[PDB]
Design an enzyme around this catalytic site. Structure first.
Site, PDB file in Angstrom:
ATOM      1  N   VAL A 119      39.435  22.108 -31.166  1.00 37.08           N
ATOM      2  CA  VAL A 119      39.089  21.351 -32.366  1.00 37.08           C
ATOM      3  C   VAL A 119      39.952  20.095 -32.395  1.00 37.08           C
ATOM      4  O   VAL A 119      41.185  20.182 -32.483  1.00 37.08           O
ATOM      5  CB  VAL A 119      39.284  22.181 -33.646  1.00 37.08           C
ATOM      6  CG1 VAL A 119      38.865  21.371 -34.891  1.00 37.08           C
ATOM      7  CG2 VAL A 119      38.510  23.498 -33.571  1.00 37.08           C
ATOM      8  N   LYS A 125      33.906  16.826 -39.362  1.00 34.65           N
ATOM      9  CA  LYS A 125      32.674  17.539 -39.682  1.00 34.65           C
ATOM     10  C   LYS A 125      32.966  18.775 -40.511  1.00 34.65           C
ATOM     11  O   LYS A 125      32.217  19.094 -41.440  1.00 34.65           O
ATOM     12  CB  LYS A 125      31.910  17.892 -38.406  1.00 34.65           C
ATOM     13  CG  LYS A 125      31.288  16.672 -37.734  1.00 34.65           C
ATOM     14  CD  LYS A 125      30.503  17.042 -36.477  1.00 34.65           C
ATOM     15  CE  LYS A 125      29.698  15.860 -35.925  1.00 34.65           C
ATOM     16  NZ  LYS A 125      30.535  14.675 -35.556  1.00 34.65           N
ATOM     17  N   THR A 172      12.702  24.429 -25.616  1.00 34.79           N
ATOM     18  CA  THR A 172      13.722  25.051 -24.772  1.00 34.79           C
ATOM     19  C   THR A 172      13.957  26.516 -25.122  1.00 34.79           C
ATOM     20  O   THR A 172      14.632  27.224 -24.363  1.00 34.79           O
ATOM     21  CB  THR A 172      15.068  24.299 -24.844  1.00 34.79           C
ATOM     22  OG1 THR A 172      15.475  24.149 -26.205  1.00 34.79           O
ATOM     23  CG2 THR A 172      14.975  22.930 -24.196  1.00 34.79           C
ATOM     24  N   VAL A 186      11.684  28.667 -24.894  1.00 30.71           N
ATOM     25  CA  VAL A 186      10.899  29.381 -23.893  1.00 30.71           C
ATOM     26  C   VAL A 186      11.701  29.438 -22.598  1.00 30.71           C
ATOM     27  O   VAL A 186      12.102  28.400 -22.067  1.00 30.71           O
ATOM     28  CB  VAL A 186       9.543  28.704 -23.671  1.00 30.71           C
ATOM     29  CG1 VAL A 186       8.792  29.394 -22.552  1.00 30.71           C
ATOM     30  CG2 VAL A 186       8.755  28.709 -24.956  1.00 30.71           C
ATOM     31  N   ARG A 204      30.980  45.246 -22.959  1.00 28.28           N
ATOM     32  CA  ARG A 204      31.961  44.870 -23.977  1.00 28.28           C
ATOM     33  C   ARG A 204      31.775  45.618 -25.291  1.00 28.28           C
ATOM     34  O   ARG A 204      32.542  45.388 -26.235  1.00 28.28           O
ATOM     35  CB  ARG A 204      31.917  43.365 -24.240  1.00 28.28           C
ATOM     36  CG  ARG A 204      31.778  42.536 -23.001  1.00 28.28           C
ATOM     37  CD  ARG A 204      32.112  41.102 -23.284  1.00 28.28           C
ATOM     38  NE  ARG A 204      31.227  40.506 -24.272  1.00 28.28           N
ATOM     39  CZ  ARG A 204      30.162  39.773 -23.983  1.00 28.28           C
ATOM     40  NH1 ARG A 204      29.811  39.549 -22.716  1.00 28.28           N
ATOM     41  NH2 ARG A 204      29.436  39.274 -24.969  1.00 28.28           N
ATOM     42  N   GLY A 215      21.555  40.813 -26.055  1.00 33.81           N
ATOM     43  CA  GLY A 215      20.467  39.887 -25.800  1.00 33.81           C
ATOM     44  C   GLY A 215      19.517  40.401 -24.737  1.00 33.81           C
ATOM     45  O   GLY A 215      18.293  40.336 -24.905  1.00 33.81           O
ATOM     46  N   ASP A 228      18.432  41.346 -15.667  1.00 28.93           N
ATOM     47  CA  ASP A 228      19.013  40.674 -14.511  1.00 28.93           C
ATOM     48  C   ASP A 228      19.728  41.714 -13.664  1.00 28.93           C
ATOM     49  O   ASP A 228      20.556  42.472 -14.181  1.00 28.93           O
ATOM     50  CB  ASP A 228      20.029  39.604 -14.930  1.00 28.93           C
ATOM     51  CG  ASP A 228      19.407  38.460 -15.714  1.00 28.93           C
ATOM     52  OD1 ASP A 228      18.434  37.861 -15.214  1.00 28.93           O
ATOM     53  OD2 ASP A 228      19.896  38.164 -16.832  1.00 28.93           O
TER      54      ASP A 228
END
Ligand SMILES: Nc1nc(=O)n([C@H]2C[C@H](O)[C@@H](COP(=O)(O)OP(=O)(O)OP(=O)(O)O)O2)cc1C=O
Ligand SMILES: [Ca+2]
Ligand SMILES: [Ca+2]
Ligand SMILES: [Cl-]
Ligand code: NA
Ligand code: NA
Length: 325
Positions: free
Chosen positions: A56, A63, A92, A94, A174, A180, A247
Site C-alpha cells: 500500500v 483511494k 473475460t 468466459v 489449504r 473454485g 486441472d
DNA sequence: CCGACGGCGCATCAGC
DNA sequence: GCTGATGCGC
DNA sequence: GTCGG
C-alpha cells in the site's frame, strides 16, 4: 472480513487493469495490496494507517481515504458506467477469453452473452467450452463435493496403476470450505527428472477418468498438464451436479515437494515466496529451488520436504492452511 | 528517481 | 514442419 | 501501483 469493502474495491480495480487496461503489473500491485490488507487484524480507519503496510503506497492510500469517507470510489463508479469497459470485463469471465480476445470481440459487436451464443463459430475450442459452462463455472464447489471428487479421482487412478500417487492441492489442500475448482498433482515412479520410462502416463489417467464419465471435456492437454471439465454422478430423479473445472499436473516424482508447494498456492503466496526467494538469492519453480550466482540459476539444491524449501530462504514453515494469501 | 515485478504448460500464429 | 513470440491459463 | 537500492 474486517476490511471487505476495501479489498473488494482493490480487487475490482485489479480486474480493471488486467482486463481493460492490459496493465498486468497494476493488476498484481492491486492484488498484493488487497492481500496484505485482508490479513490485517484490525478494522482500517484511514489510508495512512493502510500505507504502513507493504504494497500500500500513496495512490491506494488516497483511494482508501475516499472509500472510507463516502463508501464508494468515483474512479470505480465511472468504470462501471463505461459500456466498453463493462463489456470487456464481462467477456473475460468466459474461460479462454482473455483481455486481448475480449477487446477483439467488442470491436465486432459481440458484447453480451447472447452474442457469444449466436457466434459460437468465432470461438476456439477452449472458449466454446468456457461459454458452454459459463454459469456452472461461476459456481463454487463445497468441500463435501470436493471430497467425493477426490475419492473418485484417487480410486480411478489406482485402477490404472497402483504406483500413481494423486494429491489434491489448491485451496482444497489449504482447507477451504469451498473451492473454485479441482487441482490434482500426479506422480508415478516411471517419470523422474532423470528419465521418462513410460509414455502416456498422463493420458492413461485422463482416458480412465473419461471412461467413467467423470471428465467430460478437454480444454487443453499435453504430456504433463491437463485442463478440462468434470462432474459428479447424480442419483435417480436428481438434478445434475454443475460441471467443474479440473486441472491435472504430472510432476516428476523426485520433484514432488516443489510441485506440491507450487500447486498448493495460493497464487499470491507463491508470488511473495518466489519474490522473497530472489531477495535471498534463490529461484523457485515447481521443479526445483536453485541458487543464483551473473544472475544465472545454479544447480538444484536437495529437497526432502516442503520445509526444506522454506529453510533455504529463511522462512519459518507455514502450514497450507496459513498460505491463503 | 528507476528497474523489476514468479515461473511455466498448452494453443495458436507469424515467419521462414 | 520448426522456432520464437503472444495469449491464456494454473 | 509500489518499492529497494
Ligand atoms: N497465477 C497463478 N500462479 C500459481 O502459482 N498458481 C498455483 C497456486 C494455486 O493454488 C494453484 C491452483 O490454481 P487455482 O487457480 O485453482 O487457485 P486456488 O488457490 O486453487 O483457488 P480456488 O480454486 O479459486 O479456490 O496454482 C495459480 C495461479 C492462477 O492464477
Ligand atoms: Ca483450484
Ligand atoms: Ca485450478
Ligand atoms: Cl527447473
Ligand atoms: Na507501504
Ligand atoms: Na477468461
Amino acid at each position: 472480513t474486517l476490511n471487505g469493502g476495501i479489498t473488494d474495491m482493490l480487487t475490482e480495480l485489479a480486474n480493471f487493469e488486467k482486463n481493460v487496461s492490459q496493465a498486468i503489473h497494476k493488476y498484481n500491485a492491486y492484488r498484493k495490496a488487497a492481500s496484505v490488507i485482508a490479513k490485517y487484524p484490525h478494522k482500517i480507519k484511514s489510508g495512512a494507517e493502510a500505507k504502513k503496510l507493504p504494497g500500500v503506497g500513496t495512490k491506494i492510500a488516497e483511494k482508501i481515504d475516499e472509500f472510507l469517507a463516502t463508501g464508494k470510489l468515483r474512479k470505480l463508479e465511472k468504470i462501471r458506467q463505461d459500456d466498453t469497459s463493462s463489456s470487456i470485463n464481462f467477456l473475460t469471465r468466459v474461460s479462454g477469453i482473455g483481455p486481448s480476445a475480449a477487446r477483439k470481440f467488442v470491436d465486432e459487436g459481440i458484447k453480451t452473452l447472447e452474442d457469444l451464443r449466436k457466434n459460437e463459430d468465432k470461438l476456439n475450442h477452449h472458449q466454446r467450452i468456457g461459454l458452454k459452462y459459463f454459469g456452472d463455472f461461476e459456481k463454487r464447489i463445497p468441500r463435501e463435493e470436493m471430497l467425493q471428487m477426490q475419492d473418485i479421482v484417487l480410486n480411478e487412478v489406482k485402477k490404472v496403476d497402483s504406483e500413481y500417487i494423486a494429491t489434491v492441492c489448491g485451496s482444497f489442500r489449504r482447507g477451504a470450505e469451498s473451492s473454485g475448482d479441482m487441482d490434482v498433482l500426479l506422480t508415478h515412479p516411471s517419470f523422474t527428472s532423470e528419465s521418462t520410462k513410460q509414455p502416456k502416463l498422463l493420458h492413461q489417467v485422463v482416458e480412465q477418468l473419461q471412461k467413467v464419465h467423470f471428465i467430460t471435456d478437454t480444454l487443453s492437454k499435453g504430456e504433463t498438464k491437463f485442463m478440462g471439465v468434470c462432474q459428479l454422478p447424480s442419483k435417480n430423479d436428481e438434478k445434475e451436479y454443475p460441471h467443474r473445472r479440473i486441472d491435472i499436473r504430472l510432476i516428476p516424482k523426485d520433484q514432488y515437494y516443489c510441485g506440491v508447494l507450487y500447486f498448493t498456492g495460493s497464487d499470491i503466496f507463491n508470488k511473495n515466496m518466489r519474490a522473497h526467494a530472489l531477495e535471498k538469492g534463490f529461484t523457485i519453480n515447481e521443479y526445483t529451488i536453485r541458487p543464483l550466482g551473473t544472475g544465472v540459476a545454479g544447480e538444484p539444491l536437495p529437497v526432502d520436504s516442503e520445509k526444506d524449501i522454506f529453510d533455504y530462504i529463511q522462512w519459518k514453515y507455514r502450514e497450507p492452511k496459513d498460505r491463503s494469501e
